């Protein structure tokens, strides 16, 4: 286990174990704490504006890197945070790396967070967002055939699910899926080993996964709805080829593996790598941990090839 990630787990695992029974979303958000300033790689331009969508307006932050000419290969990105926390700044550095090392224009979408907007506001936001952007490939000098989707954790979930809607509705063409330790689901009655294995002490805990699933979902029945567990979708076949990264000490390790294992079955090209010395959410320790820094770049490179 990485040395910097260790001090974070030690110092963290000290404070009192949280009481998710009374813990509030306002309080977890206001509880922003853990993640000192981090390095922001540079890019040619950064543009933040509003996507005006029916019923609601969403903020977007576009990232163009240096040394890349139109029409540009892109990436519509969805930040992680349990469908509850996170915004355009918390993941601003991660997006900068994917943009710099991935050689693509990155559009980080500021979707509606729960509990305020329950499932499925996030999913509809993810899909409508991609469409709003693809409809205007010409206005952003985009190569319509090289537009990918990606995300970390809950953001990874949204990307998998958006891939599926796009397939039902015949487009827009998604060239690729970049899923970083994504929450793609499973059958709660028969949960993978990593769930029990890495239940505690590794940042993302079992009690935290439950709290998220609580603030986000409306009913128990929703636990097996495809839009929440894309892994339980009928025909995974014909979906965009993908790259899936997982972490050794992540309760969601086998969940992503399970998704890799499923797309393969429906005959979809997929590559999955497990980073042996990292935990869930490592991309946010870029420039802080020597292991996370290497992994994120490695991940941004796979994007570069895939979209090449």
164: Cβ contacts below 8 Å, ≥ 6 apart:
226, 230, 233, 236, 239
CB atoms closer than 10 angstroms to residue 271: 13
Question: DSSP string of 50-78?
Answer: EEEETTEEEEEEEEE-SS--SSEEEEEEE
Measured CA distances, 275 to 13, 16, 308 (Å): 22, 29, 24
3-class DSSP state for residue 29? helix
250, 254, 277, 289: the active-site residue: 250
- Rounded Cα gap, residues 109 and 51, in angstroms: 9
- Rounded Cα gap, residues 24 and 292, in angstroms: 30
Active site residue 250: yes
3-class DSSP state for residue 128? helix
- Rounded Cα gap, residues 84 and 261, in angstroms: 28
Active site residue 190: no
At what resolution in Å was this solved?
Answer: 2.6
CB 133 within 8 A of CB 78: no
Q: Which residues on neighbouring strands pair with residue 56, listed in sequence order? A: 53
Q: Residue 66 corresponds to which tokens in the numbers above?
A: 């240096």
Terminus-to-terminus CA distance in the chain, angstroms? Answer: 33
Omega within 30 of 0 (cis) for the link into 155? no
- Rounded Cα gap, residues 260 and 243, in angstroms: 9
53: Cβ contacts below 8 Å, ≥ 6 apart:
125, 128, 129, 132
CA 77 and chain centroid, separation: 7
280-97-141 Cα angle (round to 5) = 125
153, 183, 194, 229: the active-site residue: 153
* Domains in the chain, CATH or no CATH each: 1-308 (3.40.50.1820)
């Amino acid at each position: 286990l990485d040395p910097v990630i260790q001090q974070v787990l030690d110092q963290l695992n000290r404070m009192p174990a949280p009481d998710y029974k009374h813990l509030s979303a306002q309080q977890f958000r206001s509880q922003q704490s853990l993640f000192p300033p981090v390095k922001k790689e540079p890019v040619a331009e950064v543009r933040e504006f509003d996507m005006d969508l029916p019923g609601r307006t969403l903020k977007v932050r576009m990232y163009r890197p240096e040394g890349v000419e139109p029409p540009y290969p892109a990436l519509v990105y969805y930040h992680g945070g349990g469908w509850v926390v996170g915004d355009l700044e918390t993941h601003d550095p991660v997006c900068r790396v994917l943009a710099k090392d991935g050689r693509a224009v990155v559009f980080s979408v500021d979707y509606r967070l729960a509990p305020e907007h329950k499932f499925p506001a996030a999913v509809e936001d993810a899909y409508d967002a991609l469409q709003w952007i693809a409809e205007r490939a010409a206005d952003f000098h985009l190569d319509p055939a090289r537009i990918a989707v990606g995300g970390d954790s809950a953001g990874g979930n949204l990307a998998a699910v958006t891939s599926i809607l796009a397939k039902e509705r015949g487009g827009p063409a998604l060239a690729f899926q970049l899923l970083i330790y994504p929450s793609t689901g499973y059958d709660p009655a028969h949960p993978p080993a990593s769930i029990e294995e890495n239940a505690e002490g590794y940042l993302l805990t079992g009690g935290m996964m439950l709290w998220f699933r609580d603030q986000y979902l409306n009913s128990l029945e929703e636990l097996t709805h495809p839009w929440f567990s894309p892994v339980l979708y009928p025909d995974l076949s014909g979906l965009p080829p993908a790259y899936i990264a997982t972490a050794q000490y992540d309760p969601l390790r086998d969940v992503g593996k399970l998704y890799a294992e499923a797309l393969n079955k429906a005959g979809v090209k997929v590559e999955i790598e497990n980073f042996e010395d990292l935990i869930h959410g490592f991309a946010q320790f870029y420039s802080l941990s020597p292991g996370a820094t290497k992994a994120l770049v490695r991940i941004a490179e796979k994007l570069r090839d895939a979209l090449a």
